[PDB]
Every structure is written in C-alpha cells, then in structure tokens.
C-alpha cells in the first residue's frame with residue numbers, strides 16, 4: 001500500500017502558538033524515526049514519525065500539493081497545516097538532507 005521513501009532521525013516538535021514555544025510532539029522529548037510514506041496508488045504522501053524508545057506515533061500528517069517547506073537551518077526544518085506548525089530538529093545534517101530530499105521530491109510530483 002504505502003512505500004517508505006526515507007527514514008530520518010529527528011526530534012519532532014509542534015509549536016505552541018499560545019505560549020510561544022516549541023513542545024515535543026506526542027508529549028515526550030526524544031528522537032524519532034521519521035518517514036515519508038508514498039501511497040503510490042493515489043500519489044499522496046504523509047509524514048509519519050515514531051519515537052525510537054517506545055514506538056509512539058508522534059506525527060502523522062499529510063503533505064499537500066503546494067506546501068511551503070521551510071529549511072530554516074541545515075538541521076531544523078518546519079512547515080504548516082491549517083492547524084499546526086511542525087518542526088523537525090534533525091540528529092545530523094545527513095538526516096536533514098535525506099528528509100528534505102524526499103519532501104522536495106514529493107512536492108515536485110504532487
């Protein structure tokens with residue numbers, strides 16, 4: 001059904017707009033294995049990340065056509081939906097490059 005097109009190590013966060021600070025996605029600070037999954041049948045893509053320690057799914061969001069993916073730095077990238085701002089604090093530049101490669105690919109073929 002879905003094919004993983006990358007795996008990247010990152011601390012996944014979401015922005016608490018009310019208190020003006022980042023907070024760990026899913027409630028607990030730590031690193032996750034973050035995929036982009038391609039549903040090849042419908043040509044849709046989503047970001048899915050699971051905490052290394054306990055496998056909790058901490059992010060599961062769609063990547064819509066036209067998304068503005070902000071590579072704020074070489075190791076912190078972020079984007080928006082209509083509700084949330086998501087951030088990936090990558091474990092290394094190599095991880096960031098892997099994920100950004102796949103994201104930019106998705107945004108080209110959507």
Ligand SMILES: CC(=O)N[C@@H](Cc1ccccc1Cl)C(=O)N1CCC[C@]12C=C[C@@H]1CC[C@@H](C(=O)N[C@@H]3C(=O)N4[C@@H](C=C[C@H]3C)CC[C@H]4C(=O)O)N1C2=O
Pocket residue numbers: 015022068069070072073076078079080085089
């Ligand atoms: C128009 C728009 O939507 N603009 C958005 C950005 C954007 C532009 C275009 C498309 C989509 C998006 Cl998403 C915006 O500006 N946003 C999105 C919410 C957050 C922010 C607003 C305020 C704060 C000020 C500081 C800055 C920030 O978060 N910097 C990071 C940082 O402080 N940290 C993270 C790492 C490194 C740094 C780079 C690790 C954790 C923490 C830390 O180091 O402790 N901010 C933003 O980026």
